[PDB]
Amino acid sequence: GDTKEQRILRYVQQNAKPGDPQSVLEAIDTYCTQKEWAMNVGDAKGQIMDAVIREYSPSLVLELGAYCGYSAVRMARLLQPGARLLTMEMNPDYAAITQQMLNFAGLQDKVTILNGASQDLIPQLKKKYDVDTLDMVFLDHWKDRYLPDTLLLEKCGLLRKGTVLLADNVIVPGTPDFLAYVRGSSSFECTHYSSYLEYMKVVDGLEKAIYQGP
Ligand SMILES: C[S@@+](CC[C@H](N)C(=O)[O-])C[C@H]1O[C@@H](n2cnc3c(N)ncnc32)[C@H](O)[C@@H]1O
Numbered sequence: 001g002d003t004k005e006q007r008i009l010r011y012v013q014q015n016a017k018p019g020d021p022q023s024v025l026e027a028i029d030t031y032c033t034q035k036e037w038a039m040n041v042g043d044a045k046g047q048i049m050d051a052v053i054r055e056y057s058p059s060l061v062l063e064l065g066a067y068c069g070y071s072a073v074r075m076a077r078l079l080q081p082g083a084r085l086l087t088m089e090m091n092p093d094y095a096a097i098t099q100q101m102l103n104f105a106g107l108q109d110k111v112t113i114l115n116g117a118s119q120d121l122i123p124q125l126k127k128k129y130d131v132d133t134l135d136m137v138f139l140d141h142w143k144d145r146y147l148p149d150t151l152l153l154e155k156c157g158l159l160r161k162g163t164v165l166l167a168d169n170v171i172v173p174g175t176p177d178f179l180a181y182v183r184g185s186s187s188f189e190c191t192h193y194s195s196y197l198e199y200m201k202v203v204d205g206l207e208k209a210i211y212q213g214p
């Protein structure tokens with residue numbers, strides 16, 4: 001049966017230019033603005049995400065929550081040669097859509113999709129995926145997981161001094177426990193970026209929280 005995510009992918013395949021990431025983004029944003037809302041980070045917050053990627057030039061980025069691959073396309077198109085994005089997605093239907101989206105955009109060789117729940121996969125990164133530490137983490141999964149995954153990332157030794165966490169939706173729907181943690185901790189230097197919830201003019205924001213060590 002047909003789904004929102006299939007409709008988004010078909011719209012991209014119909015209208016965007018193969019191998020052109022910006023065209024893929026614009027197609028998604030046009031479809032979601034004109035026809036059907038979706039939980040992509042969107043262009044307004046996406047421009048802030050772009051600025052963070054450019055500033056920090058991360059070699060290894062971890063995304064929590066891929067969905068249809070919008071944010072993965074956004075980040076991966078700005079990664080330097082040899083840099084990599086790992087993106088965790090627990091829903092196999094969405095992981096499949098994301099793979100096709102990346103393939104269409106021509107970014108598949110810069111991204112690895114990890115199928116599973118972040119709480120299960122994060123502790124396997126050092127053993128199974130050869131990870132030392134992460135340069136950046138984009139949190140955009142179910143909001144109740146931001147805090148426990150942040151703690152787990154620290155416990156597992158995946159954060160180093162200067163690792164950038166970038167969290168979506170800290171205003172709407174809101175991530176109160178995660179914000180209280182990073183804003184209460186001397187291990188994080190934080191900046192708030194006020195913006196808009198995807199495809200609307202309701203205010204939302206991203207939190208940049210840079211790990212300083214224990
Ligand atoms: C808001 S959508 C991600 C949007 C995407 N970052 C973008 O901007 O294009 C949230 C996604 O997180 C996934 N998800 C929720 N909890 C997860 C978890 N614990 N581990 C991995 N994926 C999870 C959901 O299945 C869903 O696809």
Ligand SMILES: O=C(c1ccccc1)c1ccc(O)c(O)c1[N+](=O)[O-]
Pocket residue numbers: 039040041140141142143168169172173198
């Ligand atoms: O929680 C929702 C949600 C809640 C209710 C209805 C639709 C979506 C949502 C809304 C905007 C986001 O950017 C986002 O990442 C999420 N999320 O699901 O993770």
Ligand SMILES: [Mg+2]
Pocket residue numbers: 039040041140168169
């Ligand atoms: Mg979001």
